[PDB]
Design a protein around this nucleic acid. Structure first.
Ligand SMILES: [Zn+2]
Ligand SMILES: [Zn+2]
Ligand SMILES: [Zn+2]
Ligand SMILES: [Zn+2]
Lengths: 145, 146
DNA sequence: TGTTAACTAGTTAACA
DNA sequence: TGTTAACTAGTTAACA
């Protein structure tokens, strides 16, 4: 198989692996509270910094419309709460309820375990082989802008 | 978690972000005069190789027969394909292209060829050794998604 | 900025 | 096998 066909099939492999999620994780979500990957990710963000619809939408690279509806569902489930920015009283801020704290922490640990799998995948290669690969990734990502 | 893992993780991110609504990854613009999803065009492409059924098409696309039903219907309401059930009482329900779709089908096949070509050019920037290291990295990654 | 209308392109499962 | 009905989690347009 050509290097060209391999890249082709690899891309399609991760496509079906992702299904209808918007991010790649390895292993199963170990949170009893059941939420979309996107929702859990949002909770992860609010653990770091209180924020707005816009700020959330950009980190996730999805539409403010999609955020409006994810935030709303988390708000029905009392996982988040709104308040107003101090500088501009009209600005709507979102932050976590206590109940959401572990859900976010579980999502953070999930990302962290996905990264460990990669690091150890990267460790089957010499500092140089790794360098080659790093170049490859920079080359490939570039095609995608 | 070090530089390499993070670069990998981010790269997968860039793919998902490029993926969007499409269930396929193709580079460049879809130069087809008709506005169709890549899934719908890819169907047209398959039908050009071989008359077939909802199931065989669903198998090949790795999507559900219900998804196939809905896609076939849009293709059909745009008079790009036709079904045997309007003219034949055979048990098999076969889908075929209308002459209007022949070129669209051809364009989609070409789009795929060009995308392969772009990939090859990218890899051509590497020695045959360097392509073997890359090829082992790709195989190793593919493993994690089994 | 942020939210609904209308849509989208997929999913599962019950059933001629 | 292929259709449908119910659902799902995105999208853009336009204007609230
Ligand atoms: Zn989780
Ligand atoms: Zn996440
Ligand atoms: Zn096309
Ligand atoms: Zn295609």
């Amino acid at each position: 198989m050509s290097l060209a066909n391999q890249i082709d099939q690899f891309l399609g492999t991760i496509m079906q692996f992702a299904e209808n999620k918007h991010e790649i994780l390895l292993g199963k979500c170990e949170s009893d509270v059941k939420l979309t990957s996107t929702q859990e990710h949002i909770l992860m963000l609010l653990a770091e910094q209180i924020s707005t619809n816009a700020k959330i939408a950009e980190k996730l690279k999805i539409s403010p419309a999609a955020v409006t509806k994810a935030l709303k569902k988390l708000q029905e489930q009392e996982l988040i709460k709104s308040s107003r920015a101090t500088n501009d009283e009209r600005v709507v801020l979102w932050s976590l309820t206590e109940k959401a704290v572990p859900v976010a922490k579980e999502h953070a640990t999930h990302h962290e375990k996905t990264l460990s799998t990669y690091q150890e995948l990267g460790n089957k290669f010499t500092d140089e082989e790794q360098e080659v690969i790093s170049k490859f990734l920079s080359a490939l990502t570039e095609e995608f802008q």
